[PDB]
């Protein structure tokens, strides 16, 4: 033949993308959002299945030559039981029937919707969970607290809010002593609008005979009390020991208002 002028290529100098290793990347990949491309480095064909198993909520895409690849989130598969009963975990790892917050090899990532509480997608789980002895004071108050002003008033989230209010109306009419309904009434009072006031009064006014005498003596005085109250020009609530004692979450709106009307001297 003839003597070809041979040239060797300049030394390969990798980049961060080329040096990436998906095995080290669970903390990078779990917080990724919808439509966000998480680049993960070269991936061998015999690993693609492993990586798709580990991250079933993500699509595995081939971005460039030599197996260069990325994960694109497609969905959130977290379950109400694992997402709704906590405001702090955003995902969990499932292995061998067990659920763990921390990553272990062999585990499958499941991810909670980032706005799950803000959407009302937890309302059917927590309406149940919060009732009974499964009640977690901190979680269930937070759940009820946060239902007000949902999705910054997006229409889906505003309906969520309404529907839940009706469901809680029907429940707490039956027995407002049950700690979810006490918190519900407590939080209606904080909202302090026409609709929350008439929801409180509607609920309190449907309580049973025994409830009213155990809890609402301030709102339903004995005739002996009422006719004593006429003598003084102060409203009854300002002196009546039944109202200084009483539990404010069970006062009617009128009575709760009136308690504010009692002039104290500064000091």
């Amino acid at each position: 033949s003839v003597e070809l002028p041979k040239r060797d290529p300049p030394p390969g100098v990798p980049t961060d993308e080329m040096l990436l290793n998906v095995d080290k990347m669970h903390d990078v990949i779990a917080p990724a959002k919808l439509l966000e491309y998480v680049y993960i480095g070269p991936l061998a064909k015999d690993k693609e299945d492993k990586v798709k198993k580990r991250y079933p909520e993500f699509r595995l895409v081939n971005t460039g030559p030599g197996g260069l690849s990325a994960l694109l989130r497609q969905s959130y598969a977290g379950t109400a039981p694992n997402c709704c009963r906590t405001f702090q975990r955003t995902h969990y790892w499932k292995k061998d029937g067990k659920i763990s917050d921390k990553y272990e090899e062999g585990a499958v990532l499941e991810s909670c919707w980032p706005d799950v509480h803000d959407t009302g997608k937890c309302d059917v789980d927590l309406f149940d969970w919060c009732q009974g002895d499964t009640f977690d004071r901190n979680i269930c108050h937070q759940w009820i607290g946060s239902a007000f002003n949902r999705s910054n008033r997006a229409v889906e989230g505003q309906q969520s809010l309404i529907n839940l209010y009706n469901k809680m109306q029907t429940l707490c009419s039956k027995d407002a002593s049950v700690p979810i309904c006490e918190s519900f009434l407590h939080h209606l009072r904080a909202h302090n609008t026409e609709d929350s006031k008439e929801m409180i009064d509607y609920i309190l006014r449907q309580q049973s005979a025994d409830f009213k005498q155990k809890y609402m003596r301030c709102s339903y005085p004995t005739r002996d009390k009422l006719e004593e109250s006429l003598k003084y020009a102060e409203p009854r609530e300002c002196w009546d020991p039944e109202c200084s004692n009483a539990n404010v979450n069970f006062l009617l709106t009128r009575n709760y208002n009136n308690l504010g009307l009692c002039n104290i001297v500064r000091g």
Partner: nanobody
Amino acid sequence: EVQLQASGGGLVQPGGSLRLSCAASGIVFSNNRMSWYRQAPGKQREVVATITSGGATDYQDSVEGRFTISRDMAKNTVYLQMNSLKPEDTAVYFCNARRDNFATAIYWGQGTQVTVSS
């Protein structure tokens, strides 16, 4: 002379409504507790609703939610709204005025009849 004539009663089947009025003269609401009273024959009178000189209200338990008392300052007239009336609301209704911190300056007005029957 202090006048507390009540007016507005009558006949209604149960569930209807009635609005009593008391056009007080000789007394001012700015320093009087005004109250609506009942008296069914055979029984002693009873408070039904009351309003302080500042405007705080209060009710007898059996009428709470159904009745609501209000007042018009410029008209010096107190009202009783009676909704969802029960056969046991049958009584003569009248108004009562009490001077804020005097006790002896108490007055009673003329009754009005409301009866509720099928």
